[PDB]
Swiss-Prot record, chains A, B:
Subcellular locations according to the entry: Virion
Gene: D20
Identification of the protein by name: Major capsid protein
Quaternary structure and interacting proteins, as annotated: Interacts with the decoration protein; each hexon binds a single copy of the decoration protein. Interacts with the portal protein.
Top-level taxon of origin: Viruses
Known role: Major capsid protein that self-associates to form 120 hexamers and 11 pentamers, building the T=13 icosahedral capsid which about 860 Angstroms in diameter. Responsible for its self-assembly into a procapsid. The phage does not need to encode a separate scaffolfing protein because its capsid protein contains the delta domain that carries that function. The capsid gains its final stability through the reorganization of the subunits that takes place upon expansion. DNA encapsidation through the portal triggers capsid expansion and the binding of the decoration protein to the capsid exterior.
Amino acid sequence: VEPDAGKATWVAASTYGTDTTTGEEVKGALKEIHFSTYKLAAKSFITDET
Amino acid sequence: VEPDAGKATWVAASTYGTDTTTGEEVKGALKEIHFSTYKLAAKSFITDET
């Protein structure tokens, strides 16, 4: 599962040259979410007399 | 040769299921019998002179 924002830092416009800041954001970070399974079980019996 | 009984116990009028306890019969059996043989001999010797 992905993450969102993502904050781009505005630049006052004194300079030219590129000369571009970018808020130093992680290019590819993701989150694993993992699932697990439980088991319900029962037993019954029948005696050889009833 | 076999031995005899070899009894089987009756249920305690409540213990019908499993619930083990039912007794058991004769675990060691088949008594051996050995026939030995005995030997004998006789002799009688005559002479010409009599």
